[PDB]
Amino acid sequence: VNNDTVFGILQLETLLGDINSIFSEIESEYKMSREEILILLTLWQKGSMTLKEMDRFVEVKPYKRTRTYNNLVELEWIYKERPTVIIHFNEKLQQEKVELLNFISDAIASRATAMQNSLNAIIAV
Amino acid sequence: VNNDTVFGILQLETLLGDINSIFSEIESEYKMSREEILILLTLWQKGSMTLKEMDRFVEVKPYKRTRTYNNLVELEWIYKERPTVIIHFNEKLQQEKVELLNFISDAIASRATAMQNSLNAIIAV
Protein backbone atom coordinates (compact mmCIF):
# COMPACT_ATOMS: atom_id res chain seq x y z
CA VAL A 1 0.00 0.00 0.00
CA ASN A 2 1.26 3.49 -0.98
CA ASN A 3 0.04 6.84 -2.41
CA ASP A 4 -0.65 5.08 -5.71
CA THR A 5 -2.87 2.52 -3.96
CA VAL A 6 -5.21 5.21 -2.64
CA PHE A 7 -5.14 7.17 -5.92
CA GLY A 8 -5.96 4.00 -7.88
CA ILE A 9 -8.94 3.16 -5.69
CA LEU A 10 -10.23 6.74 -6.01
CA GLN A 11 -10.20 6.28 -9.80
CA LEU A 12 -13.25 4.02 -9.37
CA GLU A 13 -15.19 7.22 -8.74
CA THR A 14 -13.49 8.91 -11.71
CA LEU A 15 -14.44 6.10 -14.08
CA LEU A 16 -17.96 6.02 -12.62
CA GLY A 17 -18.30 9.76 -13.28
CA ASP A 18 -17.25 9.35 -16.90
CA ILE A 19 -19.83 6.62 -17.47
CA ASN A 20 -22.55 8.64 -15.75
CA SER A 21 -21.63 11.69 -17.85
CA ILE A 22 -22.14 9.65 -21.02
CA PHE A 23 -25.55 8.47 -19.86
CA SER A 24 -26.47 11.97 -18.68
CA GLU A 25 -25.63 13.38 -22.13
CA ILE A 26 -27.78 10.76 -23.97
CA GLU A 27 -30.63 11.26 -21.49
CA SER A 28 -30.76 15.03 -22.06
CA GLU A 29 -30.26 14.97 -25.83
CA TYR A 30 -33.03 12.40 -26.37
CA LYS A 31 -35.29 13.33 -23.44
CA MET A 32 -35.22 9.75 -22.15
CA SER A 33 -34.64 8.21 -18.70
CA ARG A 34 -31.78 5.78 -18.06
CA GLU A 35 -34.33 2.92 -18.11
CA GLU A 36 -35.81 4.01 -21.44
CA ILE A 37 -32.37 4.09 -23.06
CA LEU A 38 -31.45 0.67 -21.68
CA ILE A 39 -34.79 -0.72 -22.88
CA LEU A 40 -34.24 0.64 -26.38
CA LEU A 41 -30.68 -0.71 -26.57
CA THR A 42 -31.81 -4.10 -25.24
CA LEU A 43 -34.62 -4.21 -27.81
CA TRP A 44 -32.10 -3.60 -30.58
CA GLN A 45 -29.73 -6.23 -29.17
CA LYS A 46 -32.20 -9.02 -28.47
CA GLY A 47 -35.16 -8.22 -30.72
CA SER A 48 -38.89 -8.11 -30.04
CA MET A 49 -40.08 -9.38 -26.64
CA THR A 50 -42.81 -9.06 -24.03
CA LEU A 51 -42.72 -6.45 -21.29
CA LYS A 52 -42.31 -9.24 -18.70
CA GLU A 53 -39.27 -10.49 -20.64
CA MET A 54 -37.78 -6.97 -20.85
CA ASP A 55 -38.19 -6.76 -17.04
CA ARG A 56 -35.56 -9.50 -16.83
CA PHE A 57 -33.00 -7.22 -18.56
CA VAL A 58 -33.86 -3.74 -17.30
CA GLU A 59 -35.08 -2.74 -13.82
CA VAL A 60 -38.29 -0.73 -14.20
CA LYS A 61 -39.89 0.29 -10.90
CA PRO A 62 -43.56 -0.75 -10.81
CA TYR A 63 -44.81 2.80 -10.16
CA LYS A 64 -43.47 4.01 -13.56
CA ARG A 65 -43.66 0.87 -15.71
CA THR A 66 -46.62 1.95 -17.88
CA ARG A 67 -45.24 5.50 -18.11
CA THR A 68 -41.83 4.21 -19.24
CA TYR A 69 -43.21 2.20 -22.17
CA ASN A 70 -45.81 4.87 -23.05
CA ASN A 71 -42.94 7.39 -23.28
CA LEU A 72 -41.06 5.17 -25.75
CA VAL A 73 -44.31 4.85 -27.76
CA GLU A 74 -44.96 8.62 -27.75
CA LEU A 75 -41.38 9.24 -28.92
CA GLU A 76 -42.18 6.76 -31.74
CA TRP A 77 -39.17 4.53 -30.93
CA ILE A 78 -41.38 1.49 -30.34
CA TYR A 79 -44.87 0.17 -30.92
CA LYS A 80 -46.95 -2.47 -29.12
CA GLU A 81 -48.40 -5.74 -30.40
CA ARG A 82 -51.28 -7.32 -28.44
CA PRO A 83 -51.67 -11.10 -28.90
CA THR A 84 -49.18 -9.76 -22.33
CA VAL A 85 -47.77 -6.89 -24.41
CA ILE A 86 -45.06 -7.34 -27.06
CA ILE A 87 -42.86 -4.38 -28.00
CA HIS A 88 -41.16 -3.83 -31.37
CA PHE A 89 -38.71 -1.27 -32.69
CA ASN A 90 -40.45 1.16 -35.08
CA GLU A 91 -38.36 0.57 -38.19
CA LYS A 92 -39.41 3.99 -39.50
CA LEU A 93 -36.86 5.50 -37.11
CA GLN A 94 -33.98 3.44 -38.58
CA GLN A 95 -31.98 6.61 -39.46
CA GLU A 96 -32.73 8.06 -36.01
CA LYS A 97 -31.37 4.81 -34.48
CA VAL A 98 -28.17 5.22 -36.49
CA GLU A 99 -27.87 8.87 -35.41
CA LEU A 100 -28.40 7.99 -31.73
CA LEU A 101 -25.78 5.21 -31.89
CA ASN A 102 -23.33 7.62 -33.51
CA PHE A 103 -24.03 10.21 -30.77
CA ILE A 104 -23.16 7.60 -28.13
CA SER A 105 -20.11 6.42 -30.09
CA ASP A 106 -18.79 10.00 -30.19
CA ALA A 107 -19.45 10.50 -26.46
CA ILE A 108 -17.53 7.31 -25.72
CA ALA A 109 -14.66 8.10 -28.09
CA SER A 110 -14.21 11.50 -26.42
CA ARG A 111 -13.50 9.80 -23.08
CA ALA A 112 -11.87 6.53 -24.21
CA THR A 113 -8.33 7.47 -23.25
CA ALA A 114 -9.34 8.88 -19.87
CA MET A 115 -11.48 5.80 -19.07
CA GLN A 116 -8.65 3.40 -19.93
CA ASN A 117 -6.25 5.50 -17.84
CA SER A 118 -8.60 5.31 -14.86
CA LEU A 119 -9.08 1.56 -15.26
CA ASN A 120 -5.30 0.98 -15.52
CA ALA A 121 -4.96 2.73 -12.15
CA ILE A 122 -7.87 0.77 -10.65
CA ILE A 123 -6.56 -2.61 -11.78
CA ALA A 124 -3.03 -1.83 -10.55
CA VAL A 125 -4.30 -1.40 -6.94
CA VAL B 1 -22.50 1.64 -38.36
CA ASN B 2 -23.90 -1.24 -36.27
CA ASN B 3 -23.65 -4.35 -34.02
CA ASP B 4 -21.50 -5.22 -32.10
CA THR B 5 -22.20 -1.50 -31.48
CA VAL B 6 -25.28 -1.96 -29.28
CA PHE B 7 -23.59 -4.70 -27.25
CA GLY B 8 -20.63 -2.44 -26.48
CA ILE B 9 -22.85 0.45 -25.44
CA LEU B 10 -24.75 -1.85 -23.07
CA GLN B 11 -21.42 -2.74 -21.39
CA LEU B 12 -21.41 0.82 -19.99
CA GLU B 13 -24.11 -0.41 -17.65
CA THR B 14 -22.18 -3.58 -16.90
CA LEU B 15 -19.04 -1.65 -16.00
CA LEU B 16 -21.04 0.82 -13.90
CA GLY B 17 -22.56 -2.16 -12.04
CA ASP B 18 -19.09 -3.66 -11.40
CA ILE B 19 -17.92 -0.38 -9.82
CA ASN B 20 -21.03 -0.09 -7.65
CA SER B 21 -20.62 -3.76 -6.62
CA ILE B 22 -17.09 -3.08 -5.42
CA PHE B 23 -18.33 -0.18 -3.34
CA SER B 24 -21.26 -2.23 -2.04
CA GLU B 25 -18.86 -5.03 -0.97
CA ILE B 26 -16.72 -2.55 1.01
CA GLU B 27 -19.81 -0.91 2.54
CA SER B 28 -21.19 -4.19 3.83
CA GLU B 29 -17.88 -5.44 5.23
CA TYR B 30 -16.88 -2.18 6.98
CA LYS B 31 -20.35 -0.88 7.85
CA MET B 32 -19.66 2.43 6.10
CA SER B 33 -21.55 4.42 3.48
CA ARG B 34 -20.09 5.26 0.06
CA GLU B 35 -19.41 8.83 1.24
CA GLU B 36 -17.56 7.64 4.35
CA ILE B 37 -15.27 5.41 2.28
CA LEU B 38 -14.49 8.24 -0.14
CA ILE B 39 -13.81 10.65 2.75
CA LEU B 40 -11.40 8.20 4.35
CA LEU B 41 -9.53 7.60 1.08
CA THR B 42 -9.40 11.33 0.35
CA LEU B 43 -8.02 11.93 3.86
CA TRP B 44 -5.22 9.43 3.25
CA GLN B 45 -4.52 11.00 -0.14
CA LYS B 46 -4.47 14.66 0.89
CA GLY B 47 -3.98 14.69 4.66
CA SER B 48 -5.77 16.57 7.40
CA MET B 49 -8.27 19.25 6.30
CA THR B 50 -11.48 21.04 7.34
CA LEU B 51 -14.98 19.58 6.82
CA LYS B 52 -15.60 22.42 4.35
CA GLU B 53 -12.49 21.39 2.40
CA MET B 54 -13.47 17.72 2.42
CA ASP B 55 -16.98 18.58 1.22
CA ARG B 56 -15.40 19.96 -1.99
CA PHE B 57 -13.70 16.60 -2.67
CA VAL B 58 -16.58 14.31 -1.71
CA GLU B 59 -20.27 14.97 -2.25
CA VAL B 60 -21.80 14.82 1.21
CA LYS B 61 -25.45 15.94 1.09
CA PRO B 62 -26.13 18.44 3.90
CA TYR B 63 -28.85 16.23 5.48
CA LYS B 64 -26.37 13.38 6.16
CA ARG B 65 -23.27 15.51 6.87
CA THR B 66 -23.37 15.25 10.67
CA ARG B 67 -24.01 11.48 10.78
CA THR B 68 -21.40 10.89 8.03
CA TYR B 69 -18.59 12.51 10.04
CA ASN B 70 -19.91 11.26 13.40
CA ASN B 71 -19.98 7.68 12.04
CA LEU B 72 -16.30 8.00 11.08
CA VAL B 73 -15.56 9.26 14.61
CA GLU B 74 -17.53 6.41 16.26
CA LEU B 75 -15.72 3.81 14.09
CA GLU B 76 -12.49 5.45 15.34
CA TRP B 77 -11.15 6.09 11.81
CA ILE B 78 -10.81 9.81 12.47
CA TYR B 79 -10.91 12.37 15.23
CA LYS B 80 -11.82 16.06 15.20
CA GLU B 81 -9.78 19.16 16.07
CA ARG B 82 -11.66 22.41 16.75
CA PRO B 83 -9.66 25.63 16.19
CA THR B 84 -14.66 25.12 11.40
CA VAL B 85 -13.75 21.49 12.21
CA ILE B 86 -10.46 19.84 11.24
CA ILE B 87 -10.35 16.07 10.77
CA HIS B 88 -7.34 13.80 11.19
CA PHE B 89 -6.76 10.11 10.55
CA ASN B 90 -6.53 8.19 13.82
CA GLU B 91 -3.06 6.66 13.45
CA LYS B 92 -3.88 3.92 15.99
CA LEU B 93 -5.78 2.34 13.07
CA GLN B 94 -2.75 2.21 10.73
CA GLN B 95 -3.03 -1.59 10.56
CA GLU B 96 -6.77 -1.34 9.89
CA LYS B 97 -5.99 1.10 7.05
CA VAL B 98 -3.65 -1.45 5.47
CA GLU B 99 -6.28 -4.18 5.91
CA LEU B 100 -9.00 -2.01 4.30
CA LEU B 101 -6.77 -1.20 1.32
CA ASN B 102 -5.99 -4.92 0.87
CA PHE B 103 -9.70 -5.76 1.08
CA ILE B 104 -10.41 -3.19 -1.63
CA SER B 105 -7.48 -4.51 -3.68
CA ASP B 106 -8.97 -8.01 -3.52
CA ALA B 107 -12.48 -6.82 -4.48
CA ILE B 108 -11.01 -5.09 -7.54
CA ALA B 109 -8.85 -8.08 -8.52
CA SER B 110 -11.92 -10.31 -8.33
CA ARG B 111 -13.57 -8.31 -11.11
CA ALA B 112 -10.51 -6.98 -13.02
CA THR B 113 -10.76 -9.26 -16.06
CA ALA B 114 -14.49 -8.65 -16.53
CA MET B 115 -14.01 -4.89 -16.11
CA GLN B 116 -11.30 -4.69 -18.76
CA ASN B 117 -13.39 -6.88 -21.08
CA SER B 118 -16.31 -4.49 -20.59
CA LEU B 119 -14.17 -1.42 -21.30
CA ASN B 120 -12.70 -3.05 -24.40
CA ALA B 121 -16.25 -3.59 -25.70
CA ILE B 122 -17.22 0.01 -24.80
CA ILE B 123 -14.19 1.54 -26.49
CA ALA B 124 -14.73 -0.58 -29.61
CA VAL B 125 -18.12 1.14 -30.15
Closest residue in A to B108 (Cα–Cα): A123
Distance from CA of A81 to the nearest CA of B (A): 23
Q: How far is A51 from A78, CA to CA, in rounded Å? A: 12
**Residue A51 burial (C-beta neighbours within 10 Å; 0-12, 13-18, 19+):** middle
- In the beta sheet, which residues pair with residue A81? A86
**Residue A69 burial (C-beta neighbours within 10 Å; 0-12, 13-18, 19+):** buried
End-to-end CA distance of chain B: 9
Cis peptide before B4 (omega within 30 of 0): yes
Closest residue in A to B120 (Cα–Cα): A116
Q: What is the DSSP string of A39-76?
A: HHHHHHHH-SEEHHHHHTTS---GGGHHHHHHHHHHTT
What's the residue count for chain A? 125
Q: What is the CA radius of gyration of chain B?
A: 18
Chain B residues touching residue A10 (CB < 8 angstroms): 38, 41-42, 45
Contact B34/B23 with Cβ under 8 angstroms? yes
Contact A9/A48 with Cβ under 8 angstroms? no
- Solving technique: X-ray
Nearest to A125 among B1, B23, B104 (CB): B104
